[PDB]
Design a protein around this ligand. Structure first.
Ligand SMILES: *[C@@]12=NC3=[C]C([C])=C([C])[C]=C3N([C][C]([O])[C]([O])[C]([O])[C]OP([O])([O])=O)C1=NC(=O)[N]C2=O
Length: 109
């Protein structure tokens, strides 16, 4: 259907580093795995990113809730694009969040 990208962040480490990304994610951002794995997703943010929206994801992750926000992101080459991002918490049977999964859609239309 729509062209989306998928990533997995590890919530067992304190700053939710990305541990897996689909091919589309590298193709869309221009970054390779050597610059994506082990890092927090926020490197895709830049000057025009709305901090009110960034705030919503920071809070949702801290509370372990799903969240869906519209962010201005930037490719490796500096060019911007509109990222419709949905984060989902993945809990273990004991309620603890283990991973956050993210679906990212380039909605620049
Ligand atoms: C990013 N995708 C993305 C995917 C997952 C699974 C998670 C947990 C986060 C993201 N982010 C945001 C970033 O990691 C961070 O959570 C937020 O910026 C809020 O906290 P900070 O520390 O920045 O205040 C994504 N951010 C993007 O800009 N683009 C994505 O694709």
């Amino acid at each position: 259907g729509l062209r989306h990208t998928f990533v997995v962040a590890d919530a067992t480490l304190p700053d939710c580093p990305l541990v897996y990304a689909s091919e589309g994610f590298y193709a869309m951002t221009g970054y390779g795995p050597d610059e994506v794995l082990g890092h927090n997703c926020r490197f895709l943010q830049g000057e025009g990113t709305d901090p009110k929206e960034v705030q919503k994801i920071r809070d949702a992750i801290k509370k372990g809730e799903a969240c869906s926000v519209r962010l201005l992101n930037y490719r490796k080459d500096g060019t911007p694009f509109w990222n419709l991002l949905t984060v989902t918490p993945i809990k273990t049977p004991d309620g603890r969040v283990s991973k956050f999964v993210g679906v990212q859609v380039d909605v620049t239309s």
